[PDB]
């Protein structure tokens, strides 16, 4: 239904059509109250408007070369390049750039925009035979995602379970089959960390292994659920947009006020999923293989790496400008700290380069980005983000903490007269501009919005051990570790306890002095 | 007169009397509006109530052994132990314990409480001759601060200057003498980072060297200013107390709601400072020597190290309880991360031990804490705090980011029915307890309050290079580096290019094979 | 009989008597050859002479105040302070200073000197009743170690086992009882990392649990073995002393040439252990409890922390002297790096202060150092050492790598004429002094000796996880974690989902705006 909000079948949503598609009576709660309409609600309206700008850019002629491709469906339409299966290394590079162009529209701050799950559509389109009996749903869903620009999110993290409850009760926490019917399946359960689901059309409800499920294929499900389906509910976390709106201003919280992606709990209360929305049904094997063989996990980290690099573009220059304000950019050591930030920004662009240039042919003509680069991004990003934030905080030693409370302070001459005198920029800018730049930096790192972004980046791919284990596993599974080991084994083979085994090196029996010494 | 709110002259304020002394028409601005009364204002009332609890504790029979001493003034009254000059190492240990018992009343979160500037009073009482003409002011201010428990703060950080403006304009930014009169001195200027000054009685206005002052003794001042003096004004930063009250709850922000210390700009607009409040007057020599020779900088770091250790007590156990919630404390690697947190917590307690055990006699019977330990605390605290915060964030991989917005969600059964089943604690606690614990942890690290505390801890003592230089200077100025070097010089003297110069070691001419080889 | 080389029973060995006591036909191998006499052998002679200097210091009149105490045995003699049981905190402080004065004699580089296992003697003396049937052996060995200064080492680390071998054959790797006889017990097995055991009188052979022992009390042993007992053999690692002697000089390797402590494999081939040397016999319970209850592990980390702090004294001043040579000490950033090394140096001294000041009474009047400080030292030392070495390496950007090969280059005028011109010190010292200083720095960090010292310091106490787990366990077992948790529980008790539960704070029902906003 959401796609019927388009006035045309040969392009994705416009911003206006996307916003109207959200006025569907989805069930959302925040601060104990039900949200009437996310496009007008104080907690979501600007964040939704920010996403709508992404859809608008798709139809601006000066954007289309970098953003858009013809569809591969025969419709004659166009779409964002990352929504269509890449068939070469050059195609992936064009997708990498289209992702970048969309990230710039939120300065890298919105991470779960529609291009993230576009890789899921491409995975369905490239490898639909994975789903066996549900292959045709996969084919149909790729076309619909590609042509419409449908906004998906991924709901996969299981809720916590009380390890003291009887196992028979603890399992009613996970997504599970309740009833198999001719119209589809009725399911119940919950997922956590449904980031920006309040603004999506559909969520993919994905399998997460839990040891308490044991056997029981009723937990081994993967399906699509529309956000307006009866029994789908979101319980929202606190809204940095609404708090910034209620007690601040755009000047005081310039990022919180427009880029907040609410991390919800998604509840499924006896929801009917039609069969055409089912992708994996009572199949532990396919569920367990999906991460490696489905394609999605091998594609979306291109988007996540690019989005981060665009954010690091922003953070780098925002730091430089902030240090011009305080005047500490004159110092050699301060310049060096900024230089390391530059180096981290460079790193993730270079990884995304390598993802594309080393892309490999897969099934049905599709190309996958370099897999080792995907794992390397996942490992490095939490380290770099923590280091950059530390570099920022130790280099604005004082400018951030005493900033006047409010744009209201500037608009009250009784107060502004003193601000204009005592809080000018060191480089000749006035107090208004200095306070503006530093409040922007604070909203990036120290506001509750900034705190959440740090926590999100650090834990994006899992625990610190898990992402390093996954990097090791890719090296072993691809044969890289064996090739590295062949080099070590060759070295070991060139000598033994009696000397060299290869002819070009000199044994030391003519110069060894141990007999003489002992 | 502020102490005249006391019903007795033989004890410091009670909580009630402290609050009443704050209803004095001090001029404070926040969110473009003037504050009528900090004890009732939504941005300050709970923080003020939290400080008042400190004054209440001084008179509780169960608290008095650890908190209070007789005064040394002949009044026969008692006071907080850190308000009276320590006359032995055991006295410093009793003061460290008195500081600790007071920090626990804010769980380590309020750093700029009345005991911080109590060391300033003790410096004045211990070394009054430093001030020459103003020695009697120093003596009297010691008596007054000690007997009454007056709440001082320290305002020293100069405001920023626009380096493009004519030097004639840059100097009316700094504290400076306007006019000398018989009733006192008239001063103008500003200071930044006036942490919790809105809740104090007096601010001590301290000299900060700026290269633009050059000569001109009109900048070389140190004096005391009351908060309600005509022309004294505070410009407040955003209030985390008020925002948590307006859009949250104590359940949702248990630390922001009661422990926020607003970091203000302090403005002096042609303020009359009476002579009895002047400590250094048109004296660059005394101003530049005061940090090293006055005593205060050699005393207050004991309070800061202890307060940090109490917060680390709290953070350590709160992390443990958070990992009990999520169930990841079962993992060996998670337990190891917690153990490192324990190690950092132990470190700062151990530093405070060394401060007292290695204390040195100073002037007039007063004792100073170990100077090297103070410098070491300053260097380690930014590293430890940043490291601990990272350990916390990477170990609550998911529990923090999707927490329901509001206690209102728990109090709406339509919503609470789902929270009760999907967000239980892993260790058998219910969803209310789990969400509460994790919201307390988030307010510690990720809320705007948590973000500010991180930035405060990192920059407390200056830039990262500056605190390390201060540590180096103390080792050199104290003779420590010379003693270390004497060992290196001894080692170097025991051999030369011909062999050993000491009799007990064997030269290698009987075993050296180089002639043989070459 | 080893003590019978003393000309007096009222003092420990002199250096000369210690060296003579080592000429006993102990069976030691290195470079495939048997060692005739460790006191003359090119791999051990200077290291033995360096230990002999410790014994000589015990009898120099100017050293005796800091090094020596009367014995507590009634003999009327004296001993090194750490060899006699401490009965107060002040005694522990005197011991720490006595340890320091001995470590300064190798500039902190010999770690396994006789004072290390002196804590083992004191443990036997303080808690001899632990050993039941062997209580009198414990008493006698305390008396003997204390009065004579006998040199013990600790051999505890089990050798590796091949997990593919039959469990019956895997068991012959560990120390185990072979036969009980009338004169004592016959044992076989091995231990690894027997650091400097080649220069000791006795080794204490300690129980290390291996899962393959299972039951079988034949493994549950603790006993003392003399180094010259038939069947005791050491298999040595490479000798940095001998390599420095054969291809270097004291000028070229001033630390390798005299302070190398060879980390041997200790082999027991059917060794007869007399009953008077047995401490724990076929007793798993006592073996498992010994680490916690024996006392030794609660004592020797004082010695280890002090030795490290003395080494860090040396490294700190050696780095400063190196940066004067290179001229980079002029830079602000270099001075700051040096300042951080200073801070780490201060930290371990401060930890040793806290060990003594917070000492606790134990059994039979003995005092134990503060336990949390011991665990904190163990955790911080590997971090501090790796950081300090990296700091050193990044600050001598070129001076270390091209240093001329040999003192022979200086003594060849054909070569020295260029060195005198091209390798002077930046601070006016000649090339001989500059090259000498930088080679001393290289031997500390980059020589094979320096490389081993980095590996030893990093792994001294076990794996990085294990030492953090021990720190956590101490916090929990001591009640510290419960005391920290009581603070978190108090904070949690002061509010619920309906507001504050205490009267002094203001509820926000009067300022909450959510009803108005939603």
Residue numbers in the entry:
A (entry chain B), B (entry chain D), C (entry chain A): 2 to 519
Paper quotes:
As an FAD-dependent hydroxylase, 4-hydroxyphenylacetate 3-hydroxylase (HpaB) is able to ortho-hydroxylate phenylpropanoids in a molecular chaperon-independent manner and has broad substrate specificity and high catalytic activity. Among them, the HpaBC complex from E. coli (EcHpaBC) has outstanding activities and a broad substrate spectrum. More interestingly, we found that EcHpaB is also capable of hydroxylating a series of phenylpropanoids to generate a wide range of natural products. The highest titers were reported at 62.7 mg/L and 34.7 mg/L in whole-cell catalysis studies, respectively. These results indicate that EcHpaB has a broad substrate spectrum for the hydroxylation of a variety of phenolic compounds.
In this study, we solved the crystal structure of EcHpaB apoenzyme for the first time by X-ray crystallography. EcHpaB is an (α2)2 tetramer, the model consists of residues 2–519 for each of the four-polypeptide chains in the crystallographic asymmetric unit. The N-terminal (MHHHHHHHK) purification tags (residues −7 to 0), Met 1 and the Lys 520 for each chain were not observed in the electron density maps and were excluded from the final model. The tetramer can best be described as dimer of homodimers with chains A and B forming one dimer and chains C and D forming the other. The overall EcHpaB structure contains 30 helices and 16 β strands, which make up five β sheets. Interestingly, the low-homology sequences of EcHpaB and TtHpaB enzymes results in highly similar three-domain architecture and 3-dimensional structure. Structural alignment of EcHpaB and TtHpaB revealed a distinct sequence and structural difference in the loop connecting strands β32 and β33 and covering the entrance of the catalytic site, which consists of eleven amino acids. However, based on the secondary structure prediction, the EcHpaB β32-β33 loop appears to be segmented into three sections, two random coils were separated by a Type IV β-turn. In contrast, the corresponding loop in TtHpaB is a simple random coil. In all cases the crude modeling suggested that the EcHpaB active site could accommodate these substrates in part owing to the plasticity of the β32-β33 loop and the observation that main chain hydrogen bonding to loop residues played a key role in positioning the substrate in the active site.
